[PDB]
Design a protein around this nucleic acid. Sequence first.
RNA 1: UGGAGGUGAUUUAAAUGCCA
Length: 95
Amino acid sequence: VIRVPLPEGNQLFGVVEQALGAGWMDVRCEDGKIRRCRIPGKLRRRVWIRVGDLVIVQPWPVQSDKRGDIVYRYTQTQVDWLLRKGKITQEFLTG
RNA sequence: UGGAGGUGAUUUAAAUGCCA
Ligand SMILES: [Mg+2]
């Protein structure tokens, strides 16, 4: 079929509202809480993360409130390709 | 040969740079 990072293991999905900066990414997840993410040492070179962008993140189990870690960003090729299959519906990005 | 002072002048606008 295809190779995409689905929710496999303990991943999350991350769509930020506004970046406070300095690494911390502020995401409006549908988990319920306001979450704040940080970046590992491999992806601060080739890519670009902005508000209006959907990515997959990975949390740590602490406090289930403010978690997340960037492990993969989504391209203009797959962001809306993950729509018809309904793995995410876009009613949680503007309303 | 090579130096130390002084007096004059010197012209539109013209910002910023992943990451091994
Ligand atoms: Mg001038």
